[PDB]
Design a protein around this nucleic acid. Sequence first.
RNA 1: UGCUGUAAAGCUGGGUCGAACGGCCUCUAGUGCAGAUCUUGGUGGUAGUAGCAAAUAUUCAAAUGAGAACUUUGAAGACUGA
Length: 125
Amino acid sequence: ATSVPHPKIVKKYTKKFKRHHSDRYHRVAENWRKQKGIDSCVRRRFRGTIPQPNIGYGSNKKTKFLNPAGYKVYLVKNVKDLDVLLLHTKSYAAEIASSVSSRKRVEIVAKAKKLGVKVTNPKGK
RNA sequence: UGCUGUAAAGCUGGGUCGAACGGCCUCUAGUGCAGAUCUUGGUGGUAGUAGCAAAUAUUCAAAUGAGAACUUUGAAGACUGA
Ligand SMILES: [Mg+2]
Ligand SMILES: [Mg+2]
Ligand SMILES: [Mg+2]
Ligand SMILES: [Mg+2]
Ligand SMILES: [Mg+2]
Ligand SMILES: [Mg+2]
Ligand SMILES: [Mg+2]
Ligand SMILES: [Mg+2]
Ligand SMILES: [Mg+2]
Ligand SMILES: [Mg+2]
Ligand SMILES: [Mg+2]
């Protein structure tokens, strides 16, 4: 890891918690919703039903918010936004906003390279 | 295209697009939908399916026309039957 050393990052659940019957119906979106029905097999946690979000799956507080490279990602919209990462170049990486123009994005990439800040999306436009 | 969050969700690559939009501290509310034989609009399967069967009945040729069972004319065969 090129970042500040950390314990091995553990993700207790790596899949996506998908709402019940978002596979059965198009009108039911995958965005997680807790079943509230009286008879629900999922709300009652029958064997074979889907896993549900709960606080037990919470991430280790020491590896939380770190991408696989070990950085915390901070959203940057202009070159002056990189100033808050001057003393955190080994623990925070910059991500250039999607609505930044191709010109200002070139300026942000050039200044980030000058400052040693890592950029999570260094290619797009 | 991926990343972050247990999650509600946030951010991001590519494509499309064409004029506005967001983060943060607060304020406010007509603020979150799968259901209500919900409302309005739209769209399926059914399905090229049910069917297009009352009132006797049409046929040959020529003309016209891109195209004629169905139009026009001629010839015939019929019917309504005062
Ligand atoms: Mg019960
Ligand atoms: Mg315009
Ligand atoms: Mg504002
Ligand atoms: Mg309302
Ligand atoms: Mg609905
Ligand atoms: Mg409901
Ligand atoms: Mg209905
Ligand atoms: Mg309707
Ligand atoms: Mg038929
Ligand atoms: Mg019939
Ligand atoms: Mg007679």
